[PDB]
């Protein structure tokens, strides 16, 4: 047989529901499981779907350079093959053989999908441009003035056409406003201003953090680019600590930080979460960097070429995409993805009303104190 | 943070503006009448004009104060209404309750009423303030 | 002889109103009864009816390898022929001579009969809360009061500006109400309830379930169809469980639910139910699978070649269609069971209208009195 | 090998594009082709996909009882098997062996899908019920009367509340009409009044006919039921000749008879046409009768049982439905399935306007001829 | 040493502004050029660049069984190494040692950049024809004339009824205009252009095509995926042919078509084009397949183990991302390339408004003259 | 529950509610005029003014009742009104306006008729509202 | 089958109704004036009243006939317009063209004008008829 | 192409189109009054009526121009108007109304100012309309 070492991470390595009631390879399941199955089919052999000890992918010690993780196994003979989401690195390849990537990915972004924004106190103007509002106002006052100038400037054949054209105008205005507002309220399209990481670099309202220790953090510290360097500057000079200690921590933070946080992680885990519950997240933009999970094998082996060839065979056979759709989207729970009108949507209207009302009232008061004063005193 | 009581309160203070204005105007009218109390024909015309204005400025008080009360009621508010009610009692009392001698009381009446309306303006603004943010 | 084993399933076979008061074939009644009558009239033979003890149609036990039900009755000489809704299958075709299908059928859908057309009296206020209606009313009265004050103590400009601001206000208000109402109407309009099974595969708001175990579920399994594959994927991940106990339960749970649940069963049974009280069901989705019920007989018999002929003759003379009509619609407890707006949606408008009219007439009358009396008399 | 006799009818038997450039079974294609392929797979043998001579399914001669068609072949030894859409009948089975139906079907209806109806001269009232219109009218006149009764019946505090409530009323009315009309014009739901054959039996505006010679015509002549007998009465006593001589004739008739014709035929051909061009037809209701296309084989043969078993094997394997979806829907072209407002939609409004206008004009004329006459003469 | 065979494909490799004026590696320029520079700087070797004669990457001929292109150059000693966008494949992996992917990529979509936002001046008249606008205008003037006549020769009832009928008329008119405008707006609102390939599979209005022949089409074939299966079914039944000649043709035919056609190509090439003039394209659909470009070498070589290390080191230092940015965006001819209503849609309203205002002022002035002059003077 | 006839009944109800007070004022005015110089002349003429004035309203509202109950398919109640239409036509033809007896008689009869039509319309609305 | 000309034609005949009415009324007025040609004060008051009505019934003719012409133009109709134009010519001629002697011509003027308006009514109805169905 | 300022320019244009005729009538009225019993008294008083009347319109329309060009961010043209606002404030403070010379002088100057603002607004609108 073969010593297959991997680690428990979904949807790659998952324990069957009745794992305690089972003893064998049937316990495990996921992506890499069927992957190793097809790999053995191609080559032909027996394999024991074991697990890593320290629950680590692979790294070394700065002082003892001891490989901890699957790397330590495939290097120290404890294992013969590692079919897991093992990231490919310069150092890890300098010691063993990495097959061609079976899963290309890259760092991505995770946020909470757009929720219904604040009522927008002055939102009833959103259907139209402020310029159109000012034009309506000035047209109203100009028409009133013209009417004033056909009574003193003349004793009608003028108020008729003026009234008619004003009727036409207000008609079309009412209709346009109603139609646009109905279109707004019917479909309810949602969008967030974050379609990339450049946007996050520009603004600073919503925050963003990373796992306090991981490849992503070092990459951000490194990668001296105008954008990523700026984001590292921010996350280094920013309070409170935007970083986290685990993944689910950042996920729950974004969930409770609905509109002011965003977590960066492997695009695979992001696409996975987005399909899991509570279906209240989303990935935006594209992969910042580009990495690849590929098979591993000790430096001197015999499956290197066979596995490297089977990987391309599957990538061309439309099989890796099949397994991915299975374990990410078909299995996905988020396969799916009117209300009344509150006062907050129209409060500005009543504010304007009260304003104009008090204004007319003060005008009348001063006009009275002038008219009566003049008529009495004179 | 609207509650339907902020609109009522702001409208109420708006109206209280001219309420204070008319109270001060009535005070000034009573003062000039006290001073006063064909030059005789001129004084008669002036007092006729002022009394006409007064009699014209009676219904609005009733109207807007009843509006205050009814809107306070319709807003499930029950701490300010009870303060405007006594004024309504006095108003309805005025019918079957009510120059050279009557002004002596009308003076203090208008003074106390202006004080009440000013206090009510301040209280309504305070209510709208500490109710519009919550 | 001629023994005839059957089963008690309505309306195919049932007990007469008073079966204890009768002794013989006159006891039972149903589609299959008249069918056997016609078969005897054709082949000219007398028969004796019997019921199956096991109450099951027939099947093999993985441990005994012994057919049961009427199938076993025939195979084991306990019966001469079977006249029942005995589904045709390959396993059963290997032990008997199924006649030709006297009734074609398949899997269907069942849902609640939609009659939810009881609109509230003041439904027209649903587009926006009373919190705004009261504001509107009090704004109207305040603007009236202020126009009155202005035109009273200053017999303009204040009038013009209050007119303009009220114009703006009422504009926005009517437009908002109209738009939200149009949203409600449109959304309620473009909702196709169901037209087929795919309507359920591409949605999850309405759950769909089947019986605990039966040929229905088995067909949903081992099915190449991607649609049925996805539907089985869904039902297998049901929480709560879409699968239910005896059909009565799956029927009642949709009889109670407005439109949340659907039950998949035999098209014939669905049609039978749709004609039964409380006539709160319906069947729209065309039959998914295509099967047929047939008359069985012991393989080494002499009637199959004399039975298929009668079945075909009756299917050609429409007698079978006549019997189906009789036992489904003629015997049906349910005889046979728009876009515009009904007055029921706008009643409160006219209610308050007439209320205001009467109030105005009363006020006018009392004013007429208090004026004429106090002036001419006093 | 085997003598496979069939006939050219789509989507069962179709010649490949390069049929002249080919010589063999690869020429043909369709449903029954793959059917026979899987049948031979099950059994195992060679077959020559030949064709019938007279281009007929099967029948006999009233005088010479000679079987013309595939029946003549399987009876006179000219063929060994007939995998075609051969209808199962009493007479045809009395001579040979019919397998269990592989395709259940029944007579259906074919019409032209609903097109945008006539503009509906008085359609602008469709959004609302005539009762609501009359109520609007009577409320308007009653309000005008009440206003008349607060000027002569009294010299306001009445016109204020009346004006306000009337403003509220007309507001809600405008909004409701606009919203309902927008909902009508946005989605544009289409429906025909024909959801079954009972409807065709009731009405007589739109006609319906059948092939002047075929199983359908005889069935309609026969089948003495309140409905089908009535439809036969109609089509027998009706002018011009509703019948036709072929199928495409009736199809083109319905196409050019857009809204007054409907053709009855096998549901299979109907579902087939509905997916072909010009995608301007549709099937409604359900199968009136119930028939089945099944395999055929001479009276005494050896494939009877094997084929009867393979048929059920496929029906249970979800394969017949697969081939059907392939040759009817996947191959189907009709995989898919705003405008301005013409005057015809609102002509009634201008008619009403001119009516009321001339009415007011005549009223004014007579009022003038009375007033001036009285003032001059008296 | 070191021979380096390449190919002329932009921006990977190109000719300098004046290549004839230069002799050596300085002649060419591109991503691959700087890549080879970095590889030499890492491994410390001098190289000489060359171009392939066949202008093809590499493939076998079914008759010769002889690789061509740079693949053959390497296999046949004509080249020491290849630095080009040489897609990784299984057949090619069997003859050389592909380095690790220096650039991941896949199949993408391309469409026309939507900027069609040039609304007509009188677009607000589109909801209904001028045939109705003229009727409305003349109805207004006729009603004015008739009210004038009435109030002139009868100084009522006619006035009341004309007011009522005009109320009804204007009600219906504004409601109809508003509703049709809302229909237009909403319909134009709920149109998701594209988000993935499935958006095309479930529609047929926008055709989609690929190159005449290539790995793209081959992937679309032999693909288990039901989505790609349906897309290949569609493209195979294309009429006209969606497949096209050299990519330039498929690009231009969508450059001309507004939104009727889409072209599927390499994600890298699509991104390159999107940054090229006339900047009338875009790429939204995520990469469908997952592949990568790598550096090749003769199997029995000594650099692969010295080349994979450099490739990984550069991918980790972000140098490759820097080069991609340089050669796509920094060198891009295109820098980086709402719901409410713009004044452009309502201009004609204010135009006719001011026209009527000026006409009224002119009429008032001439009336003032003809009155005052003729009265006071004459 | 509404059926569009309850609306006409409510409208006729609110109108007859004013008609009854109209007729009561008629009767009381006749009682006061029964007194039969300048004081009495004015007390008579200023009231004959209102009398001769408030004549068209009756015709208008009665024709309105007729038209409504005709368009609402309510025939059982129209026959209870057409006789008053004939009476009003006869009045327009020839109406005396010795005269106090006839006037008070017609006033009392019309008042009773309107008070009864009140209850009739009320019961009809009540029956139509709950006819579901 | 509307064409926008049916509306114009029906409106035109509507107005022609009162056009005919006023023509007949003017004919009757001229007839009673001919008959006529303090009883003198009564006749003076009557003729003043009738002349006032006449002078009040001048602008409407111009207005509605110009409306006829302009609507016929705006409807791309070019066979009826040319028939209403001469009347507009005569109208504009009347200004700088125009009792005991003037009636002699006004009589025939009103008669011919009534005949023209009646003929035009019939023609407009015929046009609307054979244009509303096509 | 519109930019919301062409609207204010069109409005000021249509208003100055009336202002120019206003000032021309002013000038002609002064010319006719230069004649300086009951006939002349009336010919003077009936015209002084219109003069003293048509005073508020100028203030109103000028303040309107100011407010509009302020809200349209059009500053280059507001400074061409604020001096007239100061002039009108000074007039409201103290205005003589010996007097024919001053009146005709101010009339002519304001007429020229309005005629020039006409062309100014016209050119500004033309430049703003095709600034695409």
Distance CA H47, CA H25 (A): 11
Distance CA D337, CA E194 (A): 20
Nearest residue in chain D measured CA to CA from E155: D368
Q: Is E108 exposed, middle or buried (0-12, 13-18, 19+ CB in 10 A)?
A: buried
Nearest to E185 by CA among E123, E269, E228, E267: E123
The encoded tokens of residue C348 equal: 């409160």
In angstroms, the Cα distances linking F44 to C378, F106, G133 are: 16, 20, 65
Residues B110 and B26 sit within 8 Å (Cβ to Cβ): yes
Q: What is the DSSP string of A219-242?
A: HHHS---TTHHHHHHHHHS-SS--
The encoded tokens of residue G96 equal: 């700088």
Domain count, chain F: 1
C262 φ, ψ to 5°?
-135, 150
Q: What angle is formed at CA A223 by the lines to CA A221 and CA A229, rounded to 5 degrees?
A: 65
Experimental approach was cryo-EM
Phi-psi domain of C318 (left: phi exceeds 0; alpha: psi -120 through 50; beta: other): left
Residues A85 and A12 sit within 8 Å (Cβ to Cβ): yes
Q: Is A357's Cβ below 8 Å from some Cβ in B?
A: yes
Q: Is F61's Cβ below 8 Å from some Cβ in D?
A: yes
Q: Is D185's Cβ below 8 Å from some Cβ in C?
A: no
Q: Is B62's Cβ below 8 Å from some Cβ in A?
A: no
In angstroms, the Cα distances linking C151 to A9, A270, A366, C81 are: 79, 68, 14, 101
Q: Is D207 exposed, middle or buried (0-12, 13-18, 19+ CB in 10 A)?
A: middle
C-alpha torsion sign, points D261, D266, D271, D273: negative
A178 with E177: Cβ contact below 8 A: no
Distance CA E197, CA A370 (A): 75
Distance CA E76, CA E89 (A): 19
Q: Is C141's Cβ below 8 Å from some Cβ in B?
A: yes
Phi-psi domain of E286 (left: phi exceeds 0; alpha: psi -120 through 50; beta: other): beta
Residues D210 and D264 sit within 8 Å (Cβ to Cβ): yes
Bridge-partner residues for D14, per DSSP? D29
Spell out the alpha helix ranges (H) of chain B: 5-36, 39-56, 59-74, 81-95, 103-132
Distance CA C46, CA C67 (A): 27
Contacting chains of F (3 CB pairs or more, <8 Å) are: C, D
Instruction: Give buried/exposed letters for C348-373 (b at 16+ CB in 10 A, else e).
Output: ebbbebbebbbebbebbbebbeeeee
Nearest residue in chain E measured CA to CA from G63: E145
Contact list in C for residue F1 (CB cut-off 8 A) is: 344, 347
What is the distance in angstroms between the CA of the first residue and the CA of the last residue of chain G?
6
Nearest to D30 by CA among D259, D319, D288, D327: D327
In angstroms, the Cα distances linking H70 to A145, C279, H64, H79 are: 18, 71, 10, 10
Percent of residues in chain D assigned helix, strand, coil, to nearest 5: 45, 15, 40
Bridge-partner residues for E282, per DSSP? E111
Distance CA A139, CA A169 (A): 10
Q: Give me Rg for the CA atoms of chain D.
A: 33
Distance CA B92, CA B95 (A): 6
Residues A10 and A55 sit within 8 Å (Cβ to Cβ): no
H22 with A135: Cβ contact below 8 A: no
Residue E92, marked binder: yes
Distance CA C303, CA C309 (A): 10
Q: How far is E166 from chain H (nearest CA, A)?
A: 31
Q: How far is E146 from chain G (nearest CA, A)?
A: 9
H1 with E361: Cβ contact below 8 A: no
Give me the resolution in angstroms, 1 decimal: 3.2
The encoded tokens of residue G65 equal: 């006939």
Phi-psi domain of C109 (left: phi exceeds 0; alpha: psi -120 through 50; beta: other): beta
Please list, in sequence order, all residues whose beta carbon lies within 8 angstroms of the beta carbon of residue F68, skipping any fewer than 6 positions away. Answer: D138, F8, F11, F12
C-alpha torsion sign, points C239, C241, C242, C248: negative
Which 3-state string (H, E, C) describes chain G?
A: CCCCHHHHHHHHHHHHHHHHHHHHHHHHHHHHHHHHCCHHHHHHHHHHHHHHHHHHCCHHHHHHHHHHHHHHHHCCCCCCHHHHHHHHHHHHHHHCCCCCCCHHHHHHHHHHHHHHHHHHHHHHHHHHHHHHCC
Spell out the alpha helix ranges (H) of A149-260: 159-187, 197-202, 215-221, 228-236, 247-256
State the virtual CA torsion across C285, C289, C295, C301 in degrees, nearest 10. Answer: 170
Residue E85, marked binder: yes
Nearest to E304 by CA among E80, E59, E94, E25: E80
Nearest to D92 by CA among D109, D73, D78, D64: D73
| 3-state secondary structure at position A295 | strand
Of D347, D365, D372, the CB nearest to G2: D347
C-alpha torsion sign, points D42, D44, D48, D54: negative
Structural domain span for residue G117: 1-134
Nearest to E174 by CA among A334, D349, A247, A213: D349
F64 with D131: Cβ contact below 8 A: no
Q: DSSP state, E326?
A: I
Residues D122 and D303 sit within 8 Å (Cβ to Cβ): no
Q: Give me Rg for the CA atoms of chain B.
A: 18
Of A350, A362, A365, the CB nearest to B7: A350
Distance CA A208, CA A195 (A): 14
| 3-state secondary structure at position E221 | coil
The encoded tokens of residue F87 equal: 């009476």
Residues A292 and E104 sit within 8 Å (Cβ to Cβ): yes
Bridge-partner residues for A59, per DSSP? A68
Contact list in F for residue C365 (CB cut-off 8 A) is: 18, 21
In angstroms, the Cα distances linking E316 to E105, E297, F57, H88 are: 17, 22, 96, 75
* A347-377 and B5-36 helices, crossing angle to 10°: 10
Residues C292 and C88 sit within 8 Å (Cβ to Cβ): yes
Contact list in D for residue E132 (CB cut-off 8 A) is: 341, 343, 346
User: Which residue is it, tokens 């200053």?
Assistant: C154
| Cis peptide upstream of residue D154 (ω within 30 degrees of 0) | no
Please list, in sequence order, all residues whose beta carbon lies within 8 angstroms of the beta carbon of residue E90, skipping any fewer than 6 positions away. Answer: A309, A312, A313, A316
C131 with B2: Cβ contact below 8 A: yes
Residues E221 and A218 sit within 8 Å (Cβ to Cβ): no
Q: What angle is formed at CA A260 by the lines to CA A254 and CA A264, rounded to 5 degrees?
A: 50
Q: Is D157's Cβ below 8 Å from some Cβ in C?
A: yes
């Amino acid at each position: 047989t073969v010593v297959v070492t991997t680690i428990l991470e979904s949807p790659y390595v998952m324990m069957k529901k009745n794992h305690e009631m089972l003893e064998g390879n049937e316990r495990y399941e996921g992506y890499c499981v069927d992957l190793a199955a097809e790999i053995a089919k191609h080559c032909g052999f027996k394999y024991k779907l074991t697990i890593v000890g320290d629950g680590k992918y692979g790294a070394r010690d700065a002082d003892t350079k001891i490989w901890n993780g699957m790397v330590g196994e495939l290097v120290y003979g404890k294992a013969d093959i590692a079919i897991a989401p093992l990231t490919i690195t310069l150092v890890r390849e300098e010691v063993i053989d990495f097959s061609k990537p079976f899963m290309s990915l890259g760092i991505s972004i995770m946020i909470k999908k757009p929720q219904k924004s604040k009522p927008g106190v002055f939102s009833f103007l959103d259907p139209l441009a402020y310029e159109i509002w000012m034009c309506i106002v000035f047209a109203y006052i100009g028409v009133s003035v013209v009417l004033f100038l056909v009574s003193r400037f003349s004793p009608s054949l003028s108020g008729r056409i003026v009234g008619g054209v004003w009727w036409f105008f207000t008609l079309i205005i009412i209709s346009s406003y109603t139609a646009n507002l109905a279109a707004f309220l019917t479909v309810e399209r949602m969008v967030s201003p974050i379609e990339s990481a450049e946007d996050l670099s520009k603004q600073t309202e919503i925050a963003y953090g990373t796992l306090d220790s991981g490849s992503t953090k070092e990459f951000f510290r490194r990668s001296k680019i105008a954008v990523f360097d700026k984001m590292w500057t921010y996350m280094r000079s920013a309070e409170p600590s935007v970083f986290v200690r685990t993944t689910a921590e950042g996920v729950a933070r974004v969930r409770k930080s609905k509109g002011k946080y965003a977590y960066l992680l492997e695009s695979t885990m992001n696409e996975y979460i987005e399909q899991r519950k509570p279906c209240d997240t989303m990935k935006v933009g594209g992969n910042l960097d580009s990495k690849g999970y590929g098979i591993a094998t000790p430096k001197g082996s015999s499956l290197g070429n066979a596995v490297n060839l089977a990987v391309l065979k599957l990538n061309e056979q439309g099989l890796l995409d099949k397994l991915k759709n299975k374990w990410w989207y078909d299995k996905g729970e988020c396969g799916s993805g009117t209300s009344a009108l509150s006062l907050s949507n129209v409060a500005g209207v009543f504010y304007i009303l009260v304003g104009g009302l008090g204004l007319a009232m003060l005008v009348a008061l001063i006009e009275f104190c002038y008219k009566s004063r003049a008529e009495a005193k004179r | 943070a609207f509650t339907f009581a902020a609109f009522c309160y702001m409208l109420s203070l708006v109206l209280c503006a001219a309420l204070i204005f008319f109270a001060i105007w009535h005070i000034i009218a009573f003062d000039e009448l006290r001073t006063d109390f064909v030059h005789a024909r001129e004084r008669l015309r002036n007092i006729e004009r002022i009394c006409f204005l007064l009699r014209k400025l009676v219904l609005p008080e009733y109207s807007i104060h009843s509006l205050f009360c009814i809107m306070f009621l319709c807003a499930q508010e029950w701490l300010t209404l009870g303060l405007n009610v006594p004024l309504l009692f006095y108003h309805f009392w005025r019918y079957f309750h009510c120059n050279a001698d009557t002004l002596s009381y009308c003076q203090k009446e208008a003074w106390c009423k202006l004080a009440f309306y000013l206090l009510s303006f301040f209280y309504y603004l305070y209510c709208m303030i500490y109710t519009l943010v919550s």
